């Protein structure tokens, strides 16, 4: 459903003049955008969970407006705080994705370097034993 080289920033995309989409425009700047596919209930970004779409966030709004009856003093300020929370959560999903991918890549390169050194040492030992063996012969 996503073209991940474009998502990580290493490939060109559909509508290449955008280069920084908002919450909407992720769906249409995707290079793998299929028009025949149905349109999701919430139209989320990547970097968020698969359960983040098909889940209305206004249940949170009504829930914390109902059980706390003193949030009804300034309702417009409350709605502004909720919308600010929504954008902030979309940013925190991106930050968590970036930290997870970086921490994966660190140990992958850290393993591959030791594998390369093991290959180099096991290649040197063969040459050294070859020299001493031909000195024997």
């Amino acid at each position: 459903k996503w073209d991940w080289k474009w998502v990580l920033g290493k490939a060109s995309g559909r509508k290449p003049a955008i280069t920084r989409p908002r919450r909407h425009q992720w769906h249409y700047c995707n290079p793998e955008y299929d028009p025949a596919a149905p349109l999701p209930e919430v139209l989320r970004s990547p970097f968020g969970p698969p359960g983040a779409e098909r889940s209305h966030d206004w249940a949170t709004y009504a829930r914390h407006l109902q059980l706390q009856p003193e949030n009804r003093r300034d309702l417009k300020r409350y709605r502004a705080r909720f919308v600010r929370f929504m954008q902030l959560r979309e940013l925190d999903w991106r930050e968590a994705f970036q930290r997870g991918v970086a921490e994966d890549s660190r140990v992958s390169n850290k393993v591959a370097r030791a594998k390369a050194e093991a290959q180099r040492q096991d290649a040197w030992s063969d040459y050294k034993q070859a020299m001493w063996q031909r000195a024997q012969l």
């Binding site: 968020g48 991106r94 968590a96 997870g100 050294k128 001493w132």
Partner: protein, 195 residues
Amino acid sequence: EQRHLYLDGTRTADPGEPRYTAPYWVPPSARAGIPNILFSEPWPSHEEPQLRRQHAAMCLEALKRADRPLTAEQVHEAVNSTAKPVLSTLAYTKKLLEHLRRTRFVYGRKNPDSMLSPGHPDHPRLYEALPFQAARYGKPETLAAADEAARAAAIAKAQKRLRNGKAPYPQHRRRARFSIWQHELAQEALRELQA
């Protein structure tokens, strides 16, 4: 199977000391015209990490089987006497035991009749081998006393912040740590243990 010369001879090489990988022994007056790389490579051999992990595990299991304060001499002899198979020198065993103590896997106590001020590194130490890795390094009674002092200091700072126009504790915004990477990493972990 993991047995290597020291380059001095008359010993075997522990993981972390120079080996001798030349196939035939040559004396140093004789080897004077040969490049030094053709006897010992100057780099670690890429198996000393795994052997060091195995040797530390055997040192812990020997300390675990005998639940007695067990100084470096008998833990070296105890690891050696289970099958010169392992632990060629006391210095390697001391290096392993101090690393295990620094990672809170074992701890140290004074040695009677050879105290030598126990903070002096020449002092022989008694190893107890606590069962789980501790979150902190000190005696748990002293850690509890320090936690009570720190908790009272936290209450005092909060009260002083209340006399001034501030919150008792710093109020921080709650964050979101879940993402697509963590969900997919969970799926990979569940399939990996599932197989």
